[PDB]
Amino acid sequence: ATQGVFTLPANTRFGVTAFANSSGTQTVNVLVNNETAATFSGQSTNNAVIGTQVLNSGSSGKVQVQVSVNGRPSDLVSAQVILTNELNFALVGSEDGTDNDYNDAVVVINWPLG
Amino acid sequence: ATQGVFTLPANTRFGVTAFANSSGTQTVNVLVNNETAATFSGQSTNNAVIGTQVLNSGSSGKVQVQVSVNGRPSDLVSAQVILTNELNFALVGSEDGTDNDYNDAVVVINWPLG
Amino acid sequence: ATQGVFTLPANTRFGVTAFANSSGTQTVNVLVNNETAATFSGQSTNNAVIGTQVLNSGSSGKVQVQVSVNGRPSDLVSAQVILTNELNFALVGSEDGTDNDYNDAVVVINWPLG
Amino acid sequence: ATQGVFTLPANTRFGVTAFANSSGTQTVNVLVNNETAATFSGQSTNNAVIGTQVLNSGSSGKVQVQVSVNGRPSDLVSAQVILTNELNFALVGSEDGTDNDYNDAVVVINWPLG
Numbered sequence: 001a002t003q004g005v006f007t008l009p010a011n012t013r014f015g016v017t018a019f020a021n022s023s024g025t026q027t028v029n030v031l032v033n034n035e036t037a038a039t040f041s042g043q044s045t046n047n048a049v050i051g052t053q054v055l056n057s058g059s060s061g062k063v064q065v066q067v068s069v070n071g072r073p074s075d076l077v078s079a080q081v082i083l084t085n086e087l088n089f090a091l092v093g094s095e096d097g098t099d100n101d102y103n104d105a106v107v108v109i110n111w112p113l114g
Numbered sequence: 115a116t117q118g119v120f121t122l123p124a125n126t127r128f129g130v131t132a133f134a135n136s137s138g139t140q141t142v143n144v145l146v147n148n149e150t151a152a153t154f155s156g157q158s159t160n161n162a163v164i165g166t167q168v169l170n171s172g173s174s175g176k177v178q179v180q181v182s183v184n185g186r187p188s189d190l191v192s193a194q195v196i197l198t199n200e201l202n203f204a205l206v207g208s209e210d211g212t213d214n215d216y217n218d219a220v221v222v223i224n225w226p227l228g
Numbered sequence: 229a230t231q232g233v234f235t236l237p238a239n240t241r242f243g244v245t246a247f248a249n250s251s252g253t254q255t256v257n258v259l260v261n262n263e264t265a266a267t268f269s270g271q272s273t274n275n276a277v278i279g280t281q282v283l284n285s286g287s288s289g290k291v292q293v294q295v296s297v298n299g300r301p302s303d304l305v306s307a308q309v310i311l312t313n314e315l316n317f318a319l320v321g322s323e324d325g326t327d328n329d330y331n332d333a334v335v336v337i338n339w340p341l342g
Numbered sequence: 343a344t345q346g347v348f349t350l351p352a353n354t355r356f357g358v359t360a361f362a363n364s365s366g367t368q369t370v371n372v373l374v375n376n377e378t379a380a381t382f383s384g385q386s387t388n389n390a391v392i393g394t395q396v397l398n399s400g401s402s403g404k405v406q407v408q409v410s411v412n413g414r415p416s417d418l419v420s421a422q423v424i425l426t427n428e429l430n431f432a433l434v435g436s437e438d439g440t441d442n443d444y445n446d447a448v449v450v451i452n453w454p455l456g
């Protein structure tokens with residue numbers, strides 16, 4: 001199934017944060033309404049925060065995460081969880097290799113903010 | 115129900131990262147084996163990262179998050195999610211006031227690393 | 229935090245299913261727009277499906293689960309999880325006693341149907 | 343990413359329940375020890391329970407769900423959620439066609455029981 005695609009409420013601020021756990025340099029692109037709105041790159045095997053930013057979901061609410069290593073797309077896994085009917089997390093893992101730890105870039109989207 | 119308590123695999127490194135969304139300064143304590151292992155603090159209404167660290171779950175694997183604001187413990191909400199049977203998120207929201215957004219301190223624990 | 233309350237799409241069918249795991253007879257109430265729409269009951273320590281029903285979420289979409297045992301409300305835990313941005317589960321556990329297994333009545337709400 | 347595969351605690355009883363929402367007849371296989379341990383089959387567009395059972399996760403704890411329609415394997419989506427560090431849900435959706443509702447067979451695994 002499609003992964004890394006989330007529908008947020010329109011015109012809503014959200015956080016996006018990326019972590020790296022791989023020998024390869026991760027590139028994370030975050031698209032809002034099919035246009036890149038944030039980009040983070042870096043290498044870590046210690047869960048470095050390679051980027052964290054506040055974005056706006058815009059009129060469409062369409063948010064997509066893409067992960068690649070030197071242009072090669074990683075395979076994605078994702079889900080969303082809502083706590084107390086109010087607090088939202090959109091979660092992404094990605095795999096750049098063969099071990100299927102799916103932590104090579106980890107992306108967390110959270111809303112609402114403020 | 116108890117919230118903010120998670121059983122990780124023993125002796126396993128994990129990431130812990132906290133975000134703030136409130137007027138009030140958030141103090142986040144992370145306990146491993148019922149001892150404080152990390153403390154983060156800061157203030158933001160824009161989802162700033164107020165701390166991030168790698169810890170070890172230790173022999174018992176017991177990890178607990180607590181949050182205090184303006185002299186009182188915040189009410190917590192939490193869950194754990196596992197993607198593709200490999201990638202683990204332990205998620206915490208917290209409420210320091212009356213609006214029940216539960217985002218006042220948000221804490222993300224993720225494992226495995228590396 | 230409040231538990232067992234979910235905002236579903238308005239006017240939409242959903243499934244609700246309850247499982248029992250306790251020496252005590254469970255009573256599960258499902259409220260749509262604050263009025264009882266289904267009630268299930270039974271006594272099992274082996275996950276009996278004491279009820280399953282298709283309901284409509286009505287004009288407001290508000291769905292609430294409550295659980296009682298020997299006329300006493302059980303403590304609830306809950307969350308919602310969304311797979312591939314389309315498939316929704318609202319999950320409830322409940323505790324009638326002292327062991328904190330939270331499985332005494334388990335309720336799963338799923339949508340969309342058809 | 344692989345879907346429908348879950349690691350349960352070893353030698354632990356768990357519930358498995360399947361629902362149908364499709365014109366096609368669903369066949370749900372549940373594997374423990376990498377061998378089929380239960381099979382459910384039925385057809386409904388109204389979320390009917392097509393089977394429920396209690397199984398033992400065996401020495402490895404590995405549980406797998408597979409779904410087909412008239413011999414054609416359905417595409418799966420899955421995740422595991424843990425509430426209050428105690429109550430586990432392993433959730434599966436499946437798609438047999440083109441609409442990507444992923445509800446054509448829905449499978450809920452829950453543990454612990456009792």
Ligand SMILES: C[C@@H]1O[C@@H](O)[C@@H](O)[C@H](O)[C@@H]1O
Nearest residue numbers: 021022023097099101228
């Ligand atoms: C150090 C290794 O780097 C890449 O091979 C990753 O795919 C592995 O998961 C591991 O992080």
Ligand SMILES: C[C@@H]1O[C@@H](O)[C@@H](O)[C@H](O)[C@@H]1O
Nearest residue numbers: 114135136137211213215
């Ligand atoms: C700015 C406000 O600060 C505190 O009152 C928080 O509890 C509110 O959620 C909001 O973030």
Ligand SMILES: C[C@@H]1O[C@@H](O)[C@@H](O)[C@H](O)[C@@H]1O
Nearest residue numbers: 249250251325327329456
């Ligand atoms: C048999 C026991 O019955 C009640 O005490 C439940 O609260 C326990 O969880 C257990 O199911």
Ligand SMILES: C[C@@H]1O[C@@H](O)[C@@H](O)[C@H](O)[C@@H]1O
Nearest residue numbers: 342363364365439441443
């Ligand atoms: C009635 C329809 O039957 C199959 O085409 C399913 O894939 C659809 O989701 C729908 O349930």
Ligand SMILES: [Ca+2]
Nearest residue numbers: 100101102104
């Ligand atoms: Ca990897």
Ligand SMILES: [Ca+2]
Nearest residue numbers: 021022104228
């Ligand atoms: Ca890795």
Ligand SMILES: [Ca+2]
Nearest residue numbers: 214215216218
């Ligand atoms: Ca608040």
Ligand SMILES: [Ca+2]
Nearest residue numbers: 114135215218
């Ligand atoms: Ca807030």
Ligand SMILES: [Ca+2]
Nearest residue numbers: 325329330332
């Ligand atoms: Ca109990």
Ligand SMILES: [Ca+2]
Nearest residue numbers: 249329332456
């Ligand atoms: Ca019980």
Ligand SMILES: [Ca+2]
Nearest residue numbers: 442443444446
């Ligand atoms: Ca379908």
Ligand SMILES: [Ca+2]
Nearest residue numbers: 342363443446
């Ligand atoms: Ca369907």
